[PDB]
Design an enzyme around this catalytic site. Structure first.
Site, PDB file in Angstrom:
ATOM      1  N   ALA C  12       0.828  -1.201   0.000  1.00  0.00           N
ATOM      2  CA  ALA C  12       0.000   0.000   0.000  1.00  0.00           C
ATOM      3  C   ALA C  12       0.863   1.252   0.000  1.00  0.00           C
ATOM      4  O   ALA C  12       0.621   2.193  -0.768  1.00  0.00           O
ATOM      5  CB  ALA C  12      -0.928  -0.007   1.214  1.00  0.00           C
ATOM      6  N   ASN C 206     -10.600   2.722   3.137  1.00  0.00           N
ATOM      7  CA  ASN C 206     -10.882   2.508   1.724  1.00  0.00           C
ATOM      8  C   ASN C 206     -12.358   2.678   1.389  1.00  0.00           C
ATOM      9  O   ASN C 206     -12.685   3.079   0.267  1.00  0.00           O
ATOM     10  CB  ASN C 206     -10.411   1.115   1.306  1.00  0.00           C
ATOM     11  N   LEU C 252       5.376  22.554   8.342  1.00  0.00           N
ATOM     12  CA  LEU C 252       4.943  21.424   9.159  1.00  0.00           C
ATOM     13  C   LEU C 252       4.945  21.761  10.646  1.00  0.00           C
ATOM     14  O   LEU C 252       4.043  21.341  11.381  1.00  0.00           O
ATOM     15  CB  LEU C 252       5.839  20.213   8.893  1.00  0.00           C
ATOM     16  N   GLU C 254       4.471  24.555  12.080  1.00  0.00           N
ATOM     17  CA  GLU C 254       3.268  25.386  12.343  1.00  0.00           C
ATOM     18  C   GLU C 254       2.031  24.499  12.277  1.00  0.00           C
ATOM     19  O   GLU C 254       1.193  24.578  13.190  1.00  0.00           O
ATOM     20  CB  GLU C 254       3.143  26.505  11.311  1.00  0.00           C
TER      21      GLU C 254
END
Ligand SMILES: CC(=O)O[C@H]1C(=O)[C@@]2(C)[C@H]([C@H](OC(=O)c3ccccc3)[C@]3(O)C[C@H](OC(=O)[C@H](O)[C@@H](NC(=O)c4ccccc4)c4ccccc4)C(C)=C1C3(C)C)[C@]1(OC(C)=O)CO[C@@H]1C[C@@H]2O
Ligand SMILES: Nc1nc2c(ncn2[C@@H]2O[C@H](COP(=O)(O)OP(=O)(O)OP(=O)(O)O)[C@@H](O)[C@H]2O)c(=O)[nH]1
Ligand SMILES: Nc1nc2c(ncn2[C@@H]2O[C@H](COP(=O)(O)OP(=O)(O)O)[C@@H](O)[C@H]2O)c(=O)[nH]1
Ligand SMILES: [Mg+2]
EC number: 3.6.5.-
Lengths: 360, 429, 440
Positions: C12, C206, C252, C254
């Site tokens: 995945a 999903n 990121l 923040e």
């Protein structure tokens, strides 16, 4: 109401060196995790630390950095304290098993514990202070000599091990594992094939046989244990009884006392090199699970339709040595030090699988 | 890299193996001479799973033919694909087992087992990474049952951590051509339950039913039965050889299908089965595959799934298809037929999808069930077993080879324990 | 320079990474062979791509990725696909079997045979980095490798780096649909990793993405490619602030400061508003208000849970394209006027806002339509716990009878590690109740 399977958990006392090196933090450290509260109840990891007020407020919805109550309340059929002596352990542990055995019914005692919790001290003891086995066999021979009149008694001894789902004889080594196969008899007798038998005449002979067998036991150095067991050791005392002066005929009776060492469960993470040492551990873990799946199944009336005996050699070897017609006890040995914390936790919940007593 | 060692034992095992290797060679574009004449690069990508390379651009299947008479070996070697096999892998005796389990397990097979294991070791040592083994044989017979179970036991002793698949032909209650089927089948199931991870219970009656009613064949022969079993065998290991959206090897299926270590007897099936005349009258889609897979008449074990509850199920699809459709169909099957699935497993279905269909089809699917109805099969055998044991009908042919009645009693007890274990989960809470 | 190291674990994760790197190559004008024709046609030298790529002597661009799997099939597909020349040859595979869908195999037995290689490659990439922002980990909860190996890898990363941000983009199992029987065991056993070692975990199931594809995109039979492309769009929206200039940039550090209220509470939901087909791209304005309203619909959530059943504890809206701040303020006011959207009483501010001038790119052959505006919503809310409860139920339904436990304990795990982890998830759930209570 009444159940033939009971659990007795013993707490090891802190050794002198460990006590000296760990108390400093109380006054690494020790932070005793086992705090007994009753003869049928203990508490794992209590909040007994004196400076606890600063971050007890985090339990209140103020700061969610810790909210996982790690304290556990465990209930067992018997608790033995750190100051409890060997005699106090034995009097409430194996004497009813001996009464049942002399009556004519099988009896079983398991001994489980990780490394360093004092399993060997509990079951084997020391020459100065002998263990539970010595008291059991001494009481057996004393009762037999007391009951010499009107009854003839014979004693047979066997001592084997289960290792990688194979049976090995310890008193009679250099025998092919294929030769030893379980053979359930038509009269409910497990009767392992080609197993050596011995007839000791006193407790000293029994201990000589035990030491000779243990010399042949399978062991490998692992983690912090210089000598770690890799197999489940099974000792079987067959007591055959018949009448002396009364009905002198072929009819008689015979019962079995089982004393079963259980290699502790092992996290492979401890083993890096792994290899053969990883497979043995896997089998050991599987065997322990199978044993649990029997004992719990023997405590729940609902699941009494089918107990999975066949899942391992050990459980099949004890098909008629765990039910309602046989007194079974389990000696779970733990340590109150933090160095074994996780291990002890696992051990406790294994003991909790026998009878999931939800009520606290 | 995830390579399988195939072992063939007995007449039935050898015939199924020959047809299976024909099918696999066609799938990977291998000629009978061993050269590669395919038209796709993915065929050679993972061809090492079943084949070993050889100098002049040749591919020898990793097969081990075993028997105790030379007739089947001569038949296979003279077949269309006989020349592909390695001549050194043809291990055989001269005196047959004579439809006697004891001869194949103790007297005759003990002599040949050393040679067979030597060839097995030679084949396994050359493997970069051995996924497991794969045996084809019949339990109701002679050489097949005894030699197969002895080989299973010894390879399990030698390779404990590897997978041990098995494609066993269970004796039918109605289609019978051997008087001593119950003894052989019982003594074989006594050993398979201990020394295997997966056992696909095939039966000739189910295959005959599939040929008569689904394929609408007027005169089925053993070639068609072997064709069906070959399609199943190829579909089981399809994810080892080709890419896909959800890969699933043998170990993944074993983990997802075996709730307890003794319940590993399976019911196989192949979805897209139709008569030649009726091909154009159906649209081949995932719902049709699901409907044909879960139909009780498509099973290869002749055990009605409606008489029990599915402990677990595995569906291995092949072709270009949508994951949403597959998941929706599996959930619909579980919801509409909730009475046939155990309550204490919320999702009973493992799913795998490969994107390379089987050569001539737009898509296909392989079904592998595990349900309590299989216990009925053992029960039938048990009945016949006791019917021959209270009187000891043919027992002297077995004890004459060094066996004891205690072995028969233990085998019967183990089969009864397996039946009780399956019964314990047919009902539940 | 700001960098971010991407790690992909399992099938995945690798497929989502394929979608992500296709999207990034499309965004930055990088060809599949690593060459940038813009730098040669014009001259280049004034472009921002270092957040995801490293530039060599000959103009080739190597992505900052580490593809990891315990079986070779997916990495082999990548090694012979369209992007074979893009990645470094160090795409790490175990030359052995997979994890067979259980935590123990990927965490203790076979996971420890490639951990050294993964850590060495991550160390090399980090050494090449100058301003490393953090890690973006892609995996699946319900699988094998994706759970156990991810746990081992994040344990090691926390031990080594510690102070760097770590973001999970995981595939949580759906309530009803499931592609394996032992998903609850693996999902529960990953609780410790996602809780103690991660810093912000984005879950997507999903079923929700299937419903989004069916309703909004009008795709009756979607494949995993569509799901991966949607997840790639969300990750691109998250990371766009580091790459392209905008009015209000949100990096990121923040993003996490404004989103995470407490250390254990770091499980937000992610949504992407203008998911719509080209045919339905017309007949609609797709203004800021419409997409902002669509972000809050319970049907558009990509985790199968109802935010109306819980309280919104924090929200972060990341806009892309032709957007002005005043429209965003009006949309936020319109949302705050509604009573169906409940906020905790201890977060009066509520919203973080970032705006980027780069509109979303359309992948050729994709389904999403070309749009002028887009927004990614990241919402920390209490409703997610409900989904967790469902999973917990499944675990109990297997753990009463100890089904499938022998497989786990026969590969280095001990039994107690099961129950321990169930207690962890229980505690995590209790926290998500306690935060939701009104102040006394
Ligand atoms: C022209 C054409 O394609 O016709 C079909 C056809 O009519 C049908 C009836 C085929 C046909 O199958 C049979 O007739 C049959 C008979 C007994 C037992 C099994 C099959 C077919 O023979 C079989 C054949 O199957 C294949 O081509 C697969 O690749 C198959 N091949 C083999 O098994 C094989 C065996 C020996 C030599 C070469 C190939 C396969 C399946 C699984 C895994 C690998 C390969 C197919 C599609 C057809 C014909 C030719 C009519 C069917 O079988 C298969 C395996 O597809 C029967 O059920 C399907 C439905 C098909 O519509
Ligand atoms: N969103 C999304 N999920 C996927 C995709 N592929 C697989 N999954 C999910 O991944 C879960 C299981 O993980 P796997 O795909 O088997 O990969 P893994 O986690 O490494 O486990 P292994 O099979 O042991 O390798 C399944 O439940 C799927 O729902 C994908 O392409 N997109
Ligand atoms: N499918 C299939 N089954 C067969 C074949 N030959 C025999 N059988 C089955 O196998 C059983 C006989 O076993 P057999 O092969 O003779 O065992 P062996 O003598 O040890 O090789 C019978 O019940 C048959 O139904 C075959 O070619 N194909
Ligand atoms: Mg792979």
């Amino acid at each position: 109401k009444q159940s033939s399977i009971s659990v007795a958990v013993r707490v090891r006392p802190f050794t002198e060196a460990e006590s000296n090196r760990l108390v400093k933090i109380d006054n690494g450290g020790l932070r005793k995790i086992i705090n007994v509260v009753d003869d049928r109840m203990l508490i794992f990891d209590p909040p007994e630390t004196n400076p606890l007020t600063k971050m007890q407020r985090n339990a209140f919805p103020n700061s969610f950095k810790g909210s996982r109550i790690r304290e556990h309340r465990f209930v067992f059929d018997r608790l033995f304290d750190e100051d409890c002596t060997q005699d106090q352990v034995y009097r409430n542990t194996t004497q009813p098993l001996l009464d049942s055995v002399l009556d004519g019914y099988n009896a079983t005692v398991f001994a489980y514990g990780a490394t360093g919790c004092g399993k060997t001290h509990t079951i084997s003891g020391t020459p100065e202070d002998p263990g539970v086995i010595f008291l059991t066999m001494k009481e057996l021979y004393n009762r037999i000599e007391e009951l010499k009149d009107t009854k003839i008694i014979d004693i047979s001894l066997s001592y084997l091990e289960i290792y990688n789902e194979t049976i090995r004889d310890l008193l009679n080594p250099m025998t092919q594992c294929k030769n030893l196969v379980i053979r359930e008899d038509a009269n409910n007798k497990i009767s392992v094939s080609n197993l050596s038998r011995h007839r000791p005449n006193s407790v000293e002979e029994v201990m000589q046989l035990i030491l000779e067998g243990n010399k042949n036991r399978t062991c490998s150095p692992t983690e912090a244990n210089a000598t770690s067991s890799r197999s489940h050791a099974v000792l079987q005392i067959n007591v055959i009884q018949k009448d002396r002066t009364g009905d002198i005929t072929e009819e008689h009776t015979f019962a079995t006392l089982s004393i079963i060492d259980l290699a502790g469960s092992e996290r492979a993470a401890a083993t890096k090199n792994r290899g053969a040492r990883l497979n043995e551990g896997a089998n050991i873990n599987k065997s322990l699970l199978a044993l649990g799946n029997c004992i719990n199944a023997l405590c729940d009336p609902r699941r009494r339709n089918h107990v999975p005996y066949r899942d391992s050699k050990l459980t099949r070897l004890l098909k008629f040595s765990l039910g309602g017609n046989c007194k079974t006890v389990m000696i779970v040995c733990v340590s109150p030090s933090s160095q074994h914390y996780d291990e002890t936790l696992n051990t406790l919940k294994y003991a909790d699988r026998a009878k999931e007593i939800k009520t606290k | 890299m995830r390579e399988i060692v195939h072992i063939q034992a007995g007449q039935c095992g050898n015939q199924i193996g020959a047809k299976f290797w024909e099918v696999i060679s066609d799938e990977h574009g291998i000629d009978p001479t061993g050269s590669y004449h395919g038209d796709s690069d993915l065929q050679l990508e993972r061809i090492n799973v079943y084949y070993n390379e050889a100098t002049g651009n040749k591919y020898v299947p990793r097969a081990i033919l075993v028997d105790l008479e030379p007739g089947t070996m001569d038949s296979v070697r003279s077949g269309p694909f006989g020349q592909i096999f390695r001549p050194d892998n043809f291990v055989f005796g001269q005196s047959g087992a004579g439809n006697n389990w004891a001869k194949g397990h103790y007297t005759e097979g003990a002599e040949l087992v050393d040679s067979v294991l030597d060839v097995v070791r030679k084949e396994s040592e050359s493997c970069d990474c051995l996924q497991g083994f794969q045996l084809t044989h019949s339990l109701g017979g002679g050489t097949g049952s005894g030699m197969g179970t002895l080989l299973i036991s010894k390879i399990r002793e030698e390779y404990p951590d590897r997978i041990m698949n098995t494609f066993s032909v269970m004796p039918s209650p109605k289609v019978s051509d051997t008087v001593v089927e119950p003894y052989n089948a019982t003594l074989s199931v006594h050993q398979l339950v201990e020394n295997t991870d997966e056992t696909y219970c095939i039966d000739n009656e189910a295959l005959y039913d599939i040929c008569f009613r689904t394929l609408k064949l007027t005169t089925p022969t053993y070639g068609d039965l072997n064709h069906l079993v070959s399609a199943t065998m190829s579909g089981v290991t399809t994810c080892l050889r080709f890419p896909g959206q959800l890969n699933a090897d043998l170990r993944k299926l074993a983990v997802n299908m075996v709730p307890f270590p003794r319940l590993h007897f399976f019911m196989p099936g192949f979805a897209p089965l139709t008569s030649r005349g009726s091909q154009q009258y159906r649209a081949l889609t995932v719902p049709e595959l699901t409907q044909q897979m879960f139909d009780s008449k498509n099973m290869m074990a002749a055990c009605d799934p409606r008489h029990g509850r599915y402990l677990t199920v595995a569906a291995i699809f092949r072709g270009r298809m949508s994951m949403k459709e597959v998941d929706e169909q599996m959930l619909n099957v579980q919801n509409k037929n909730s009475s046939y699935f155990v309550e204490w497993i919320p999702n009973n279905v493992k799913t795998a999808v490969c994107d390379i269909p089987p050569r001539g089809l737009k898509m296909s699917a392989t079904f592998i069930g595990n349900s309590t109805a299989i216990q009925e099969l053992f029960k039938r055998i048990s009945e016949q077993f006791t019917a021959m044991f209270r009187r000891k009908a043919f027992l002297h042919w077995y004890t004459g080879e060094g066996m004891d009645e205690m072995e028969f009693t233990e085998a019967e007890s183990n089969m009864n324990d397996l039946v009780s274990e399956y019964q314990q989960y047919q009902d539940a809470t | 320079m700001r960098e971010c190291i991407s790690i992909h674990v399992g099938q995945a994760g690798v497929q989502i990474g394929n979608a992500c790197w296709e999207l990034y190559c499309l965004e930055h004008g990088i060809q599949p062979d690593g060459q940038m024709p813009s730098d040669k046609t014009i001259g280049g030298g004034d472009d921002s791509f270092n957040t995801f790529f490293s530039e060599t002597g000959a103009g080739k661009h190597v992505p900052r990725a580490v593809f990891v799997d315990l079986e070779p099939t997916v990495i082999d597909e990548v090694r012979t696909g369209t992007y074979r020349q893009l990645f470094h040859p160090e795409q790490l595979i175990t030359g052995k079997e997979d994890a067979a869908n259980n935590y123990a195999r990927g965490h203790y037995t076979i996971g420890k045979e490639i951990i050294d290689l993964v850590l060495d490659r991550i160390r090399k990439l980090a050494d090449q980095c100058t301003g490393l922002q953090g890690f973006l980990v892609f995996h699946s909860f319900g699988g094998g490798t994706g759970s156990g190996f991810t746990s081992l890898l994040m344990e090691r990363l926390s031990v080594d780096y510690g102070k760097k941000s770590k973001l999970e983009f995981s595939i949580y199992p759906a309530p009803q649909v499931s592609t394996a029987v032992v998903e609850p065991y693996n999902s529960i056993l990953t609780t410790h990793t996602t809780l103690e070692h991660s810093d912000c975990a984005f879950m997507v199931d999903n079923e929700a993405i299937y419903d989004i594809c069916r309703r909004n995109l009008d795709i009756e039979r979607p494949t995993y490619t569509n799901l991966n492309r949607l997840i790639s769009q969300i990750v691109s929206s998250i990371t766009a602030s580091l790459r392209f200039d905008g009015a209000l940039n949100v990096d990121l550090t923040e993003f996490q400061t404004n989103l995470v209220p407490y250390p254990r509470i770091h499980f937000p939901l992610a949504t992407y508003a203008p998911v719509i087909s080209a045919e339905k791209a017309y007949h609609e304005q797709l203004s800021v208000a419409e997409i902002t309203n669509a972000c809050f619909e319970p049907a558009n959530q990509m985790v199968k849970c109802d935010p109306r059943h819980g309280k919104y504890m924090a929200c972060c809206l990341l806009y892309r394209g032709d957007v002005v701040p005043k429209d965003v303020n009006a949309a936020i006011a319109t949302i705050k006027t509604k009573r169906s959207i409940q906020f905790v009483d201890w977060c009066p501010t509520g919203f973080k806002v970032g705006i980027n001038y780069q509109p979303p790119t359309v992948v050729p052959g994709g389904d999403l339509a070309k749009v002028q505006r887009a927004v990614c919503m990241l919402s920390n809310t209490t409703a997610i716990a409900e989904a967790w409860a469902r999973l917990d139920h499944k675990f109990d339904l297997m753990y009463a009878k100890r089904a499938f436990v022998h497989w786990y304990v026969g590969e280095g795990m001990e039994e107690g590690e099961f129950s321990e982890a169930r207690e962890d998830m229980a505690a995590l759930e209790k926290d998500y109740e306690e935060v939701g209570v009104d102040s006394v």
